């Protein structure tokens, strides 16, 4: 049985410099360390953290005056970032910088009271960030998931429009409601194609050309992980057995069956000590040797902030 691994999969550069963010505070400051909600969406590096001293918290109401607050990667709307503020909180915030990017367009919509639509999944903390920038009576800010959602919507002016994209979406399916908003509003202004991140693009082509080669897709990652459930969806939509797995533990053996190749990726939250245990499981299960498919280089690293340098 043949092992492929998709290239690039696994840590992105958000990821990477959020998990840093919280380990250099824990290096400097001692523990406790607060972050708003988990860091990433994988249990694994949030289960790590949690040992090594970082509370996990849901409000900022339950952090004490004097302490460090982090935010999460996946940023956080104007009023929880101003209800920070007004706190005696020392805070470092570990937001993408490839979401601020986003977050800054909304926020220029919002001074000019024009309309803003995002293309994104509801109840998601990206999209709550997101659309948490936009702060004007007179313009409005409405979030849309599917290509139905496009077609249901009343804009006040149609003339003066734009839209944005949380970034881990399916590159394909948001094609397919940017097509809908632009003959559906023809003068809707946006970027070029979407604001998927590169991190996304990539790891979407890479399971793409590993589900072409493989009957069994394995994507290492968690259920609260938008891009990783993005990665299973893609694999399970080209006629493929896809799985999302937190551990190799997850792995069951009728899905190895007698597959002749099955492949495995990881989506930007999870590390890559978890794909080797996946790749050790089914080498235990018949396996051969991982070769590595090849792909897209990746160069982009995104530094900590300078309080936090190590
Ligand atoms: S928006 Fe940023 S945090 Fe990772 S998944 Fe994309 S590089």
Redo the contacts with the bound molecule.
Sequence with gaps: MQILLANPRGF????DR?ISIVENALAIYGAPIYVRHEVVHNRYVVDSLRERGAIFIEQISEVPDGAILIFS?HGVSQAVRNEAKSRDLTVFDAT?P??TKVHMEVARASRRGEESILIGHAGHPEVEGTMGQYSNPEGGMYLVESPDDVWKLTVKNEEKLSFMTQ??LSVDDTSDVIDALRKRFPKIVGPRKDDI????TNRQEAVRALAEQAEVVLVVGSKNSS?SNRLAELAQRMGKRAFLIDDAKDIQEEWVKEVKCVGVTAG?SAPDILVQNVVARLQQLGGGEAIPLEGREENIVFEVPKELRV
Excluded: I, R
């Design positions: 992105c550069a958000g990821v959020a990667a993408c490839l979401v970034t881990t991140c590169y991190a996304t891009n930007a």
